[PDB]
């Protein structure tokens, strides 16, 4: 039907071509009759008749007389829905400027004319004349004149010069403007200029003019002459009940514009004096400029209720516009909602639907069936059958519901498990029964949470909900490979209670001939559910290619663990239920069943687990009484001791030995010690409190206390809510975040007093307000993340690259945070990962790493796996299925089509409501200082002459478990490559003394080290050594600024000690604030200290990492590898001369002199190493160290926010957001291609344009990749609708409309808006068919 949406400027003759008549009167309707009035804003000759096939006179009234324009009324009889699609046009008496091309801040009339906006609005408001082609007889073209200046210029020049005023002047400017010659002049001036601000200005002006030439528009269509009106049924005048009416607010603004246009017409026709017609044009132009937008140009005009009226631009912008209220999400028929309940008898693809909702939703199906059975031959009878709800309309409903999935959905829909499908089961009720295993996915509680239902009508949708959205299909989360249907809180406590043993129950020691005699014993009450019993089990391994092999045995186990074993299917080993089987141990059974057996005997397994866990927590009778909180007996003693210590420290502080800040952390110390000692002294009282006796004395064991079995088993509890029921509940905070000294020392069993309850209420009103504001932030975060990742769709099967990032386990200073195996589980390789016997490839180059290739790496202990990643995929407009990886909520590779962008946006969006001196080796390995120069000190050990100094603890197998980073200048107690023990302080340094240590030895001299100008006399007054210390350059005189104290070394034989290896001299020009203790002419050694120099949020950290904001103290880096120096030092700027060994020297950089520098002004720095310290922007990381460094920086710096809160997220979901941030890449040199120099074209298009040019004989383009934040990389998009259905719309429509932009409908929001199939899943093959048949 249509391929593309084109937007452009609308001429004053296009507007006369849409329109069906000129709205000449302000009046809307008649008042006695409610007839539309000829010819105002609701007419009928203009916009069409009010009743279907009926004139206004009514003399023609039929479909038989269709189409004929009447004679008494001029009203063309048609349907009456033509009033939604017929516009009228107002003829403005003077032109008025359009407010979008004037006030949207990069103002198009402004930067098109190169006239500043203040001078334009001083013309439009008739204040100042502006020349229009007066020539350079005396004046400039776009020079404004004030009134008296105009008057004397008119006295000197009556002729040969013309200066108009107002919108006629601006229109004479625009239609007098030439485009090609002015574009040539600006192109030559851009060629000649060198200032980059003016270069960017001319680039913007050139690009605007070039888009104006390439689009078919002219510049003067920015000035409205013929104003089009909306059709009437888009701004209705619906009668309310009682002779009352209600208008959309557009009728008022249109009435205002028509009124001022009529009055201006009559003011010209009366030949008014010019002050009144200038006031009248000022008054229109504004009535218009309000209609088009209210609040922009000054203050908005308001209605009777002291509220501004809703203009045209208000019906598009924001949450109340069409774009995100009526067009993206719509209200939907065949729907309904209710409260939800449990109903735990369901199988997990079923749901409870009431007989009243299901009779209502399935209405037209019951009509279509009651016509089929002959029970009602029409629809007027089939309606009244289901109206009175006969006995036979309830048998029809059980047919039309039988295999028709419904679509349950909770209200804060976060991820794709928030909408699932269920074959419904009819309930006599009013609530929605819903399986217990799926409330973990929905995050649904039965505290009154409501869920909406939906009906897939069409035959494709009943299959879509069964193959993709059914509950038995979604058992793994899309965010990571963890299962999602885990047993939640009651079933797991029941399964904990069953799988236990006590030391002496009934029937202990009897032998059992199967897991069924275990049921017969327990149901007859002859043995307890916890009795250590020799049963014989029969477990099946599938060791061969699917061969279930029996092997009976004789396992020492319980009567509970043997009863439970009959629920476990065939292939699982028996040692998965031969434990206490808490919450964690269940989800690692319902995952091994999914891996070993498959999908179907895991979906049948989770129902049996739930049915058994409920039934055996029923018979458990597991209550909670007030005696189940055993308050420890040593709590009183501990609290008495810690109350003696605080009074002692309080006496000492009054004795002046300690200050308030020293007793503060000494009282908080003793209370945080006693708060631990209480909680540790009660845990030996909770869990071991069962001390029972088998045939003898006593045996302690794990307790059958009820509050221990609800926290040990993981079923709704922890060790931190306990210690607030029996132990003391510790220290509390205050609204400053400061911790209160005197803690609250009563458990919830003993009750709180008034003051302890008041103290521990800021902690609750701080936590509740946190979740109040947290959801408001986390909604907006995933709103941005979805729209930055729309059009990413798995489009190929292999892009064919060998690039891709390199993976390493996360060794963050101490232990391994996340190992290599869990980072590269399910991601194909880019190189052949081979064993450290490096003549043999262990894995092939493009294998998909599932577990069976993970374990071959885990045995051969590989540390670095090069992997294929999304951000290195060479697919234009999409991501190849290899480069993405595994399906992650399906075990196989990703299916071609499946839109990873949205599912990787939601997996970062939905956890967002859960957010806010010496180095010691602590293991056994070998010391590895990596890639760092380091000299032998005067003590013979190793002192550090490197900035990026990295300590590794290489194990006996060549891997690292402990990595470290060493600062500059640290003495090494050990050596490299040799095994050391644990607890070894291997390196040591002062965190304050910065050594400026040498590398050569011999007699040092104080060359260029003089007093009075460079150094001062502040000797060691405490010991008696002549310390020759240096002042700073801010305090010393200007004769010794660049003259720095160097350390040149000679010998006593007249020769000079220089740098060995090279021919360069060995001197070290010390900067200011240098404290030298040595002397001149005395011998120095290698590695001797020359001069002793002195020195987040959870959610907003993610929201600023994805936004890529500039941190306030950027780490200034080394922009080019080479030697470093200091140029001419300005007042606050030290022009850091970075001289390469071969390249261009004069890159100097003004460094704020007050910032603490790091490099010692003479070091050959590698490119992209630090000059100062601080958090770095990802813009600098990208420009210096490339794409693969920023894609590691972001996925490290955001996994260190998610793992801190214990949220696991696979890293591909962050790699695709990184990939969608750098889609734009500005050009450096255009080359032979058709680009400009400083323009920012998108990298996908330049990846094709020079691709065919290098495929041709020509040269390519040199382009630097560019990073944008997700509020900008989503707003700099090719498709102007997926950027306008977002934040600012008046910017994007205006910028696109002056550019003649043309959406191609390739993303997903655009195809959602326009109403066709998205190009993602089921609708992918149809779009492939369309794009194949088109261009063919």
């Amino acid at each position: 039907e249509f391929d593309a949406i084109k937007i452009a400027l609308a001429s004053p003759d296009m507007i006369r071509s849409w329109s069906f008549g000129e709205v000449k009167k302000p009046e809307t309707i008649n008042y006695r009759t409610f007839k539309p009035e000829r010819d105002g804003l609701f007419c009928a000759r203009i916009f069409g008749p009010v009743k279907d096939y009926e004139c206004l006179c009514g003399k023609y009234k039929r479909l038989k007389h269709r189409g004929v324009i009447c004679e008494k009324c001029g009203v063309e009889v048609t349907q009456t829905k033509v009033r939604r699609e017929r516009m009228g046009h107002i003829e403005l008496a003077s032109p008025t400027a359009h407010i979008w091309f004037l006030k949207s801040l990069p103002s198009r009339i402004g930067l098109l004319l190169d006239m500043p906006l203040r001078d334009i609005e001083r013309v439009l408001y008739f204040e100042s004349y502006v020349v229009i082609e007066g020539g350079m007889t005396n004046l400039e073209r776009q020079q404004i004149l004030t009134e008296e200046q105009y008057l004397d210029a008119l006295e000197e020049f009556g002729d040969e010069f013309d200066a108009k005023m107002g919108a006629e002047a601006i229109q004479a400017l625009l239609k007098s403007m030439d485009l090609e010659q002015e574009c040539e002049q600006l192109r030559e001036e851009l060629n000649e200029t060198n200032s980059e601000t003016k270069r960017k200005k001319l680039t913007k002006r050139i690009k605007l003019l070039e888009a104006f030439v390439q689009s078919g528009n002219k510049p003067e269509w920015m000035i409205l002459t013929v104003l089009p009106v909306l059709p009437p049924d888009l701004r209705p005048l619906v009668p309310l009940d009682g002779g009352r009416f209600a208008t959309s607010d557009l009728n008022d603004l249109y009435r205002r514009v028509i009124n001022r246009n009529n009055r201006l017409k009559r003011l010209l026709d009366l030949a008014a004096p010019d002050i009144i017609v200038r006031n009248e044009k000022r008054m229109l132009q504004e009535a218009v400029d309000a209609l088009l937008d209210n609040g922009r140009r000054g203050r908005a005009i308001t209605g009777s209720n002291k509220r501004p009226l809703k203009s045209l631009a208000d019906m598009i912008k924001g949450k109340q516009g069409r774009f995100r209220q009526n067009l993206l999400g719509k209200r939907v028929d065949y729907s309904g909602r209710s409260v939800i309940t449990v109903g735990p008898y369901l199988r997990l693809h079923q749901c409870g639907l009431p007989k009243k909702m299901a009779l209502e939703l399935f209405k037209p199906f019951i009509y279509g069936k009651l016509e089929l059975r002959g029970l009602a031959t029409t629809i007027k009878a089939a309606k009244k059958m289901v109206e009175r709800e006969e006995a036979v309309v309830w048998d029809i409903l059980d047919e039309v519901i039988r295999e028709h999935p419904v679509l349950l959905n909770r209200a804060p829909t976060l991820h794709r498990l928030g909408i699932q499908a269920f074959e419904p089961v009819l309930i006599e009720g009013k609530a929605i029964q819903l399986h217990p295993l799926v409330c973990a996915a929905y995050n649904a509680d039965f505290d009154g949470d409501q869920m909406a239902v939906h009906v897939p009508l069409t035959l494709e949708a009943q299959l879509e909900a069964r193959a993709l959205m059914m509950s038995t299909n979604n058992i793994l989360s899309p965010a990571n490979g963890e299962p999602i249907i885990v047993p939640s809180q009651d079933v797991v406590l029941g399964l904990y209670y069953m799988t236990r043993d006590c030391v002496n129950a009934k029937g202990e020691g009897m032998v059992l001939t199967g897991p069924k005699e275990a049921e017969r014993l327990y149901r007859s009450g002859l043995a307890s559910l916890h009795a250590r019993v020799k049963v014989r089990i029969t477990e099946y391994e599938k060791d061969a290619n699917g061969e279930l092999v029996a092997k009976t045995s004789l396992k020492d186990t319980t009567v509970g663990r043997a009863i439970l074993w009959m629920i476990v299917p065939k292939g699982l080993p028996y040692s998965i239920v031969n434990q206490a089987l808490g919450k964690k141990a269940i989800s690692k059974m319902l995952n091994t069943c999914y891996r070993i057996l498959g999908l179907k005997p895991t979906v049948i397994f989770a129902d049996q687990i739930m049915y058994t866990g409920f039934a055996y927590a029923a018979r458990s009778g597991a209550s909670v009484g007030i005696d189940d909180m055993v308050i420890p007996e040593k709590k009183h003693e501990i609290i008495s001791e810690a109350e003696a210590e605080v009074a002692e420290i309080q006496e000492q502080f009054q004795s002046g030995l300690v200050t308030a800040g020293e007793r503060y952390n000494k009282v908080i110390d003793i209370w945080a010690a006693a708060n631990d000692r209480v909680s540790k002294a009660m845990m030996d009282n909770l869990q071991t409190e069962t001390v029972i006796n088998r045939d003898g004395q006593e045996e302690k064991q794990v307790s059958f206390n009820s509050i221990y079995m609800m926290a040990d088993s993981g079923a709704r509890g922890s060790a931190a809510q306990i210690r607030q029921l029996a132990g003391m509940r510790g220290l509390m905070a205050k609204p400053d975040g400061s911790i209160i000294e005197t803690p609250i020392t009563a458990n919830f069993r003993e009750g709180l007093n008034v003051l302890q309850y008041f103290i521990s209420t800021h902690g609750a009103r701080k936590g509740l307000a946190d979740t109040a504001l947290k959801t408001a932030n986390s909604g907006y975060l995933t709103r941005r993340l979805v729209d930055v990742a729309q059009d990413l769709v798995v489009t190929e099967d292999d892009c064919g690259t060998h690039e891709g990032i390199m993976m390493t386990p996360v060794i963050e200073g101490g232990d391994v945070k996340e190992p290599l195996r869990d980072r590269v589980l399910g991601r194909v390789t880019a190189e052949d990962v081979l064993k450290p016997g490096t003549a043999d490839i262990l894995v092939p180059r493009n294998t998909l790493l599932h577990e069976q290739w993970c374990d071959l790496l885990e045995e051969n202990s590989v540390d670095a796996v090069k992997v294929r990643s999304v951000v290195s995929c060479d697919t234009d407009f999409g991501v190849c299925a290899h480069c993405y990886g595994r399906d992650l909520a399906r075990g196989h590779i990703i299916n071609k089509g499946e839109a990873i962008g949205v599912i990787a946006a939601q997996s970062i969006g939905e956890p967002g409501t859960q957010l806010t001196s010496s180095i010691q080796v602590k293991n056994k390995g070998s010391i590895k200082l990596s890639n760092v120069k380091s000299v032998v000190n005067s003590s013979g050990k190793l002192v550090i002459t490197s900035r990026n100094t990295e300590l590794k603890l290489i194990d006996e197998f060549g891997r690292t478990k402990e990595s470290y980073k060493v600062p500059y200048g640290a003495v090494l107690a050990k050596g490299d490559g040799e095994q050391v023990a644990g607890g070894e302080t291997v390196a040591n340094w002062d965190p304050h003394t910065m050594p400026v240590i040498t590398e050569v030895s011999g007699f040092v001299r104080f060359t260029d080290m003089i007093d009075g100008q460079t150094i001062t006399r502040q000797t060691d007054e405490l010991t008696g050594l002549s310390s020759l210390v240096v002042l700073d350059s801010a305090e010393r005189t200007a004769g010794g600024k660049d003259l720095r104290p160097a350390l040149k070394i000679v010998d006593a034989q007249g020769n000079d000690v220089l740098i060995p290896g090279t021919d360069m001299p060995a001197q070290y020009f010390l900067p200011g604030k240098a404290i030298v203790q040595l002397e001149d002419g005395v011998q120095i050694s290698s590695g001797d200290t020359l001069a002793r120099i002195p020195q987040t949020g959870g959610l907003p950290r993610v929201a600023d990492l994805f936004e890529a904001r500039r941190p306030k103290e950027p780490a200034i880096l080394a922009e080019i590898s080479g030697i470093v120096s200091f140029g001419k030092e300005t007042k606050g700027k030290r022009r850091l001369v970075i001289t390469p060994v071969d390249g261009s020297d004069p890159y100097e950089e003004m460094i704020p002199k007050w910032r603490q520098l790091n490099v010692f002004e003479g070091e050959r720095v590698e490119r992209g190493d630090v000059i100062s310290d601080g958090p770095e922007a990802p813009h600098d990381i990208l420009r210096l160290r490339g794409v693969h460094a920023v894609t590691r920086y972001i996925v490290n710096e955001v996994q260190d926010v998610y793992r801190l809160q214990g949220v696991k997220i696979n890293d591909k979901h962050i790699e695709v957001i990184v990939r969608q941030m750098l889609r734009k890449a500005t050009i450096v040199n255009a080359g032979s291609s058709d680009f400009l120099e400083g323009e920012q074209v998108e990298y996908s298009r330049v990846k094709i344009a020079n691709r065919e040019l290098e495929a041709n004989g020509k040269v390519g383009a040199t382009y630097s990749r560019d990073l944008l934040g997700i509020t900008k990389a989503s707003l700099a998009t090719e498709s102007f609708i997926s950027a306008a259905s977002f934040q600012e719309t008046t910017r994007v429509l205006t910028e696109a409309a002056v550019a003649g932009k043309r959406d191609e409908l390739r993303g997903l929001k655009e195809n959602v808006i326009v109403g066709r199939l998205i190009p993602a899943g089921t609708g992918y093959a149809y779009h492939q068919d369309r794009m194949r048949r088109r261009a063919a």
Partner: protein
Amino acid sequence: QRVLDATQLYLGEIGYSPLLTAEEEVYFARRALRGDVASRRRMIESNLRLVVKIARRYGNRGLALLDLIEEGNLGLIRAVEKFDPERGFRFSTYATWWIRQTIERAIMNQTRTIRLPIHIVKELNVYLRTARELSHKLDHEPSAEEIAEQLDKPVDDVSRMLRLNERITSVDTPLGGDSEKALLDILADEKENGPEDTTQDDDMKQSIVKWLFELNAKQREVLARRFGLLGYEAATLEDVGREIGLTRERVRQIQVEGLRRLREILQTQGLNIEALFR
């Protein structure tokens, strides 16, 4: 450099003409009424401050201030058009009538979204003035009955004219205070049938056509042209008398016969008068 709003620029502008004396006004009108346009320009250009002074009083009605000023300007142009200096009067007394009346007609015209005429608005203002004077006599709101008492006019007339003072509401204002629900969410499209009534009509049409073809031809042609149903026009019994069957009484007879057959055919499907008409 003036701050560029329309009111400040205008009110600063209008002072650039010295106010005219009486002999000055008379001489300018003598030059003006014989067709010298400069005199008209001077007379209208000077007395703009009179228009701002007069239209100052008409503020805070439905029109904004500059609308009132510009509509007074039209009457001022009318006033210099029809001023007479031969009465010897000062110009302000004669122009005050024209400016005051052409702002009064402006507020009567361009205020209400549904335009009431002049005489209806004057009649409503008579009643509102009566209610304002009646409220101090009984210290409550005077009823429609009370105004009809005090003016001795019929109660239905005063009720109608007060109901024509409805103060037509907006749609876009939210309801209930919370800004989530305006009248667009409350109002239902009443003329457009939904799919249920729209499929009942089509099923009823096809059922009618099926039952008519179930009836014999001579009856159904009479019943087709009789109501314009089966692709025909709704004809008279006299018309189909001259067109098909010459005895008009027999056309009535075959019509009653076809109606009885269709009554039987409808009731065989269980559709009785209670079924189709509740």
